Ligand binder design. Structure first.
Ligand SMILES: O=C(N[C@@H](c1ccccc1)[C@@H](O)C(=O)O)c1ncnc2[nH]ccc12
Length: 167
């Protein structure tokens, strides 16, 4: 039993809700919140910009030190950093950005990072401003993630479309 509330159950291990991931993280304080990151951990917009704003830019400060030490992430890769005031940990995961021409096959690799954590609050990778089809992102999620994932979909209209088209 966990503290996530109001989710629709899609499969044995995937759950979905029309919610703002920032407000959802502040309420639940999950062990892991997933950020829709880029390789430079520049949290400028989309989910990343919103999560970082909620941390009063502390996420960005921590991320800049991480990059200065370690260099950029790989597309499809991840790193674990602090969750600040939102979660115990933030798993920064880099899905491919279609508006940068990156290989969508990397989406499966990106979701594989979720399997290193028993329970996660997450957005749909490569969705929104990353340019991929969110219905496809949800399919890859269900077919790749085996741990318990709670997906927050900001847009109510998108949320309803994802539920109604789900196979
Ligand atoms: O969910 C968000 N963005 C994603 C998204 C996917 C599909 C359709 C539209 C947008 C995607 O752009 C991403 O960045 O993962 C988002 N963006 C800004 N502020 C936010 N506050 C809470 C959530 C949230």
């Amino acid at each position: 039993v966990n503290s996530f509330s109001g989710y629709l159950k899609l499969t044995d291990n995937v759950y979905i809700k029309n919610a703002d991931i920032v407000e959802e993280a502040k309420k639940v304080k999950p062990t892991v919140v997933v950020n829709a990151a880029n390789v430079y951990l520049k949290h400028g917009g989309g989910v990343a910009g919103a999560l970082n704003k909620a941390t009063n830019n502390a996420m960005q400060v921590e991320s800049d030190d991480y990059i200065a030490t370690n260099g950029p992430l790989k597309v499809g890769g991840s790193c674990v950093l602090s969750g600040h005031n939102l979660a115990k940990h933030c798993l920064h995961v880099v899905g491919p950005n279609v508006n940068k021409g990156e290989d969508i096959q990397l989406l499966k690799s990106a979701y594989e990072n979720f399997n290193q954590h028993e329970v996660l609050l997450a957005p749909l990778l490569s969705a929104g401003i990353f340019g991929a089809d969110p219905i496809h992102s949800l399919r890859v999620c269900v077919d790749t993630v085996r741990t318990n994932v709670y997906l927050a979909v900001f847009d109510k209209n998108l949320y309803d479309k994802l539920v109604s088209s789900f196979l």
